């Protein structure tokens, strides 16, 4: 007999203060007990479990289920209670690779390590918490008591300890064979390389040799799957990759569950299918928790869906990552706060695509939205490829320079060059830094009554021009915006505006080009038409003339 | 130092469980090399899945150094590590460190790697070298000695550090030496020629007791509350007087007796913004009395070591940045301004990142602790890029300002 190395045991503890599980064993049918006893007697012969005495005070229920064509009962141990009491582990399998970050491999083998899983022993001081009882026939003898010696299926710490134990075993083989790559997924093991079909087969035998040192027999996976690998919702091909088939259903009655399963398909497809839009379909789910509510599609939601069927009419594919070539990312504005981007290395051979949606807020502008999308692509690219891509953005170099130099916040976008793909991101207005000579000066103010909601907004100017407008169903902040709107409405192409509204200044200094406030949008449409707008602020109720005259005119 | 100092978290707090943010390839490769040697020297060791804790890690380059350095964002562990009184009820911060002409900052963090850590505490210093595209499981480590950037590292080492410095302090009683985390602040009151000699004579003395060869020179001579200044003009426009009254109205929150009645009396009417208004006798007087008030410091300002230090920053354009350090609004304990940030005339974030480091260094020298920053930047932008320009072994706290402050004009 050939000595094998013992797999190093991982010390496991329960959560602090908690004991082990003491769940009662359900009554089972006689025909069920006979099937468990047969299964466990085989498992006991294989060393997986071991009989124990009645001194062990823990128990975990066991169950018997079957398949309809498989003519056998199956053995299920319900570790729901022991999992609640088991410590937390470093779950090292949460994040999966993205296909756009993989390198093409000429040859790839699949090895089954299902029998390898049972070779992983369990911490001896923890095995007593995995006790379970097979009820006896007619409850006339003590039930057969067992405990696990290996990682039990369904236990909390089994996947992390199995993946970690296999990683430690493979580490010498991988580190010293740098011309191959190894990846583990469930009871499978995937090894890929660019060696010839001969040298590739030798390394697999060398790797089979290396796994026998701990005594792990690994044959090939049953029914060797032909291209593509159906893995985690993807189609992995020898040279290309794409998502599993995105078929959008036809329907005349869409519930909010149908729209939910829809958006999931577009969101998943949007990583390779360029131009996918999901908002007008997401606006039909703004606030609901019951899933049958048939919500009629707006004319914009249909137009968005039909635009997606056109994008999903023909299958598109992503290429694998060539580290020797540059990484490029290109963004396009799509309207209503939506943005699409493509990431590639050779023109028209996308690695992946994606989309970004504008954040929820009352005011915004295109440059902010473009900046946010760039950061998201930056973070995604560093995850997938470990580097920031070169950006091609639809904004003039002069526009961006004027923006960030005058913006009150600090902002930065990495290396980027302008691409002339309309619609171009532009600055729709720019306030003056100094008062304008010869331009009429509009002193504006508004005021409302908190109780009756009645208010007034208006202005007085240095040329004697005046206006006061009465308002109903309004607030102090709304009349302050209305007053500025009136001055913009009634002035020439160049105008100085004096206000005391810290609220209005805070909005305009944020430089929005679109707003959820219909009144702010109207002010923006007026600023766009102007030539020079100098917005000046003064404190209220301090005797500033012009401000004092119009404050009394609008306050009752 | 065979004996380990018993360390424990605070009651009812688990160890840190902070996600590791993505790293570039060159930083992953750098961290792999550094950690491979550190593991060979026994400073760190591989860990298994039974350790659920994690503390983020990345790689920087210290001020004008081409070698990659490992930085561990121990911020969460430091708040969860129990409040330390390792030798005494606390260290009295040297108020004379901020009064010296020159202060040199030495990175003495490599001396921490000589004393082991409590075995029961090593699991809380777990960190992960991430992999590109999750293609391999992350390399998991935990520390065997005191790690750089941990609150307990200077505390546990204070007993050992004070004995290394005792003969150098015995011969130079006028030299102030202060320690904050991985840094030694050594200041004196003398000409730089003998200062670098004393500094060189200090690190050679540290070398014989068991370094890095890098320094950071400061001059806390010019650290105070910068005064509020009003313009001096011969012809005032309506716009000039409006900004003046607005600035004086803002200062009136801080200072008493600030009057604006006679200056507002100048704006009697609805005049053009560019029209020049002559100052009356009662207006120039009111402006003069306001100048006298603003010459004097703020009433009732004091540092409270129980409260947080708050540091606000304003972007002023052309590489200029203003800031204020306070604990209560309108009670500024320090104000200042920066200009022409080195190597970033075209990068706003790099300038802001360098400003945060400078303000933090100033706060360490004055009060012995770092402030909480209100940063004029969107969360996602700062979050993505600040590590690319960070060069200090410590990391302060920060929040994000999303509404443009009107007081930016008043610090212009
Ligand atoms: C080797 C490997 C395997 C997996 C398996 C997951 C599953 N089911 C996952 C990772 C992360 C993985 O690791 C890496 C790391 C870096 N680079 C790549 N690149 C790459 C390049 C080509 C591939 N193949 C596509 C499909 N096949 S085939 C017979 O035609 O279906 C042809 C070859 C595969 C695969 N496989 C992988 N893989």
Numbering used by the authors:
A (entry chain A): -1 to 554
B (entry chain B): 4 to 213, 227 to 428
Could you pull the original sentences from the published paper?
HIV-1 reverse transcriptase is one of the most attractive targets for the treatment of AIDS. However, the rapid emergence of drug-resistant strains and unsatisfactory drug-like properties seriously limit the clinical application of HIV-1 non-nucleoside reverse transcriptase inhibitors (NNRTIs). The tolerant region I, which is formed from V106, F227, L234, P236 and Y318, is a modifiable chemical space that can accommodate various substituents.
Here we show that a series of piperazine sulfonyl-bearing diarylpyrimidine-based NNRTIs were designed to improve the potency against wild-type and NNRTI-resistant strains by enhancing backbone-binding interactions. Among them, compound 18b1 demonstrates single-digit nanomolar potency against the wild-type and five mutant HIV-1 strains, which is significantly better than the approved drug etravirine. In order to confirm the drug target of the synthesized DAPY derivatives, representative compounds were selected to test their inhibitory activity against WT HIV-1 RT. These selected compounds exhibited inhibitory effect on HIV-1 RT with IC50 values between 0.19 to 0.056 μM, being evidently better than RVP (IC50 = 0.43 μM) and ETR (IC50 = 1.35 μM).
